[PDB]
Amino acid sequence: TGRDDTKETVYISSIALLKMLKHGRAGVPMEVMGLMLGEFVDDYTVNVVDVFAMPQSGTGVSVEAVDDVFQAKMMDMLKQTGRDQMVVGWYHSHPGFGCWLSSVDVNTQKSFEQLNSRAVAVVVDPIQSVKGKVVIDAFRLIDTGALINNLEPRQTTSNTGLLNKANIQALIHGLNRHYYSLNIDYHKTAKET
Amino acid sequence: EQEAHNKALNQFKRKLLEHRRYDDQLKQRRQNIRDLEKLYDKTENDIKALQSIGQLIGEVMKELSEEKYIVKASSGPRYIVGVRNSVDRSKLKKGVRVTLDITTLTIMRILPRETDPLVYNMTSFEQGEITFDGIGGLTEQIRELR
Amino acid sequence: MVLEATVLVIDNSEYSRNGDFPRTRFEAQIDSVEFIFQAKRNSNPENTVGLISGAGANPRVLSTFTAEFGKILAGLHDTQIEGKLHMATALQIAQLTLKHRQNKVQHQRIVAFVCSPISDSRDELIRLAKTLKKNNVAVDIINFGEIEQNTELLDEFIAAVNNPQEETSHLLTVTPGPRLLYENIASSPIILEEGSS
Amino acid sequence: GDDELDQEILNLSTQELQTRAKLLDNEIRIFRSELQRLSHENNVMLEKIKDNKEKIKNNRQLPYLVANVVEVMDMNEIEDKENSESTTQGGNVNLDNTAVGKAAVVKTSSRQTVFLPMVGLVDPDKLKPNDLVGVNKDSYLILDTLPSEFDSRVKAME
Amino acid sequence: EIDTILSTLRMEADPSLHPLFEQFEKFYEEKLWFQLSESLTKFFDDAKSTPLRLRLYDNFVSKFYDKINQLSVVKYLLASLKDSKDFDESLKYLDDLKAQFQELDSKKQRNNGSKDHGDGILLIDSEIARTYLLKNDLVKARDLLDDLEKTLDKKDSIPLRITNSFYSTNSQYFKFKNDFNSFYYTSLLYLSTL
Amino acid sequence: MSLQHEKVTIAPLVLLSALDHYERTQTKENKRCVGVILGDANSSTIRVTNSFALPFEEDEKNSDVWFLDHNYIENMNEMCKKINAKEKLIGWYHSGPKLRASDLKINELFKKYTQNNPLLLIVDVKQQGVGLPTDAYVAIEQVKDDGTSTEK
């Protein structure tokens, strides 16, 4: 193909973590809509310095829940302080469900996939997070045509090759036909420690 | 001309007329900023409301500890919930109506207990109080009650 | 003249509450800055203007870089005259402000009103004159404050600055007596000066 | 009468009336200065109202839950000394944000009864017992007002 | 206008006070009246013992009070009724200038978009109480001092100059009663904020 | 203003986000950075919920010469109100590692912006003190020992 299509190890900093949990636990019941701002390097490593909650909405999750005014506004002011970063994906809350992407979440995912094909969609459920990794997982579209011809595993090299999934249900149904799942790791310095 | 002050009175008359028009626009700007500010407040307190987040009601079914209390949810199942520091546990007592978070599912604050609406109608007949004398005659009797 | 970003220092002192210009001097400064603000913007619409005060224990920031006269005129009325000139510290603050700009092709100008006697030494201001042309900023002094009980020393800091730079430096001479302040700026160069290369 | 004319020539000299008009030209200029600042205060307000509304419209857009209002409970700030609640805690005087007391109790068509902080756009006048109301599906806050429902029994009554 | 009066005042005044009159007229011609405040204060230190401060100040105050700060008018005011023997006399200027400053704060402030005038009222209420203590109406003075004290606590940025006057008026009150302890603590605030 | 502000509760986000601001602007070696701290106030317990950089500039010739951008501050407040209705202006962090006397002047800006005495939050990001990574300071006015004036 024309990409390696190998699922990225997601290193969300400890600063970012704290943000992401806070915004989803606040908005319950409700889906909170944000974007992930970092920098993508390599072909398998994303480093998430900070995240942004874009303003909450009553349409849930859709492409008609992206707000490009509000997106730009964030961007323009990072430049001006010199803290500029670019999107590597987006995140959202399920207020009381497991971690999967719906069909409708796959299309939100799709908008960013045009921007770069290593777009991650991260699902937070904060009623079941009594630990910092649990019930959070990151997903990434695979090419539709890789599926038809059975090149779907190829994330099994450039990685640990371990893959802890959660649940039967919607997870295995979208894993098969849309996305490839891989664990979110969490990274920190000794000044933070 | 006789004097060139003749001509100037008319120029000068414009300056009086301008003071009149402008003085009404200057109060009118100050009225607008008050009108708009009231509107901005309606939309803004709607934003606040969205971030307030709805709540669930229960009633304290029965004390179990001063730490933990069993509530009977109006939504359905019985739960054991905590308490926060935003509710007084000196005013939680058995059969007090409570409100609680959905997110934490923990008593947020006291509510005064309402009663079943049938027993509400019985209280409501009340005319807000009356006066001392509304009964003519039978003066001996009035004393006994009092 | 064109393609320029200007940080104005309106001097606000306890010598502006006096009738020297109708009604009070303070009010004529509001009229005169509106001239400078609107003129340069009309001559190039990528020209934006900030605002600081020569008032207070230290200079404060009235306004940032802007294309809004709504924003400028909010800060000209609502600055107070209870301050004191602080000319040296004001020139350096402009130097920080003109460090960053909206578009980095824009020329550096300070236009400083003087409405009162100096609180800063001549010698200090000599040495700071050479810092101004080292950072290729031109400095324009509106003079009416130096000639209320002093011999003029402003000619000296202009002369030192003045080279081929990226802009012309100039000394505007205004009559401090009543002949209306906005008018006096118009008839002196303010769009009649042309930037040097 | 009116000033700056022939009648004032008789009372006040030609020199004196003219120097009285030299005062007046300066007041138009200061008044202008005031007026133009005040006009920008309206402009900045306006932008933010439109900005708020887009967030509210997202909610008001469909679908949304249908519910009825059982009763209204309204308390004011400084209920003891602090708060619109009837509890004991220091500060946080607010309308409903951190100190709830302005509220509607609604009965949901989702088989709950819930106590929701009152919404800023919906008024305490247009919430009273037995009003039919929209409650927002994403978060149970009181969304909008619906007409009354009717039956074949109502028709006959008209 | 005002030129004759100053000329009568200068003739009455000593030759050593003569250049100070000359400067008032010199500065007036220039049309800077701030320079005029500076000179005036100097005159009133060295000529409070002559009775000539009781006529000089009125002429300047009742034209300029807006072309000069509130501090300047009160600065003059304090020195003038400083050594004054009739308190009925004294009471009348304090009231006339209180009413003047109230009016000033509605008109100037809209037009300039600058300049407060409600600071000047505060300092006059000190001096009314100070005038009451001197009549031997100690008790009456104390009711206005409580009222001013409350007004002060409304403000979250209280000046030195104004509370210096206020701690003062209070310190005079206690030692007329011969409370030694009450005096000493309140005077320690006056000295420190001086 | 406000009088009650006695104890300052500090989220673990705050220490880490200030830490990140310092090193993502490449302001180091005592080039200071000023960002705002938002949260709730008007009460004894002061929660700092979120923190973000602002543009700032500093001079080493006289140290009481600086730039703070007000326009960015206005835009931040509008945006974040929608995020959470629990963020309002409660003061400003100063990135440390030390308190300056120049932070006394910068404080008068933040005192104007918000009607409460504004919190100064020192976030020690250079960590040379074994305790106190956070110090909380509220500027107040008081009359000062040894016969001296009302000093800030």
Swiss-Prot record, chain B:
It comes from the Eukaryota. N-acetylated by NAT1. Belongs to the AAA ATPase family. The 26S proteasome is involved in the ATP-dependent degradation of ubiquitinated proteins. The regulatory (or ATPase) complex confers ATP dependency and substrate specificity to the 26S complex. This is 26S proteasome subunit RPT4. It comes from Saccharomyces cerevisiae (strain ATCC 204508 / S288c). The lineage of its organism: Eukaryota, Fungi, Dikarya, Ascomycota, Saccharomycotina. The chain holds residues 49 to 194 of 437 of the full protein.
From Swiss-Prot, chain C:
GO terms for cellular component: cytosol; nucleus; proteasome complex; proteasome regulatory particle, base subcomplex. Signal peptide: none annotated. The keyword Ubl conjugation applies. Disruption phenotype: Cells are viable. Ubiquitinated, leading to its degradation. Ubiquitination is promoted by HUL5. GO terms for biological process: proteasome assembly; proteasome-mediated ubiquitin-dependent protein catabolic process; ubiquitin-dependent protein catabolic process. Residues 5-190 form the VWFA domain. The 26S proteasome is composed of a core protease, known as the 20S proteasome, capped at one or both ends by the 19S regulatory complex (RC). The RC is composed of at least 18 different subunits in two subcomplexes, the base and the lid, which form the portions proximal and distal to the 20S proteolytic core, respectively. Present with 17200 molecules/cell in log phase SD medium. Multiubiquitin binding protein. Belongs to the proteasome subunit S5A family. This is 26S proteasome regulatory subunit RPN10. It comes from Saccharomyces cerevisiae (strain ATCC 204508 / S288c) (Baker's yeast). The gene is RPN10.
Curated annotation (Swiss-Prot), chain E:
It comes from the Eukaryota. Transmembrane segments: none annotated. Coiled coil: none annotated. Belongs to the proteasome subunit S11 family. Acts as a regulatory subunit of the 26S proteasome which is involved in the ATP-dependent degradation of ubiquitinated proteins. Present with 12400 molecules/cell in log phase SD medium. This is 26S proteasome regulatory subunit RPN9. It comes from Saccharomyces cerevisiae (strain ATCC 204508 / S288c). The chain holds residues 6 to 199 of 393 of the full protein.
Swiss-Prot record, chain F:
The modification N-acetylserine is found at residue 2. Residues 8-143 form the MPN domain. N-acetylated by NAT1. It comes from the Eukaryota. Belongs to the peptidase M67A family. Acts as a regulatory subunit of the 26S proteasome which is involved in the ATP-dependent degradation of ubiquitinated proteins. Present with 19800 molecules/cell in log phase SD medium. This is 26S proteasome regulatory subunit RPN8. It comes from Saccharomyces cerevisiae (strain ATCC 204508 / S288c) (Baker's yeast). The lineage of its organism: Eukaryota, Fungi, Dikarya, Ascomycota, Saccharomycotina. The chain holds residues 1 to 152 of 338 of the full protein.
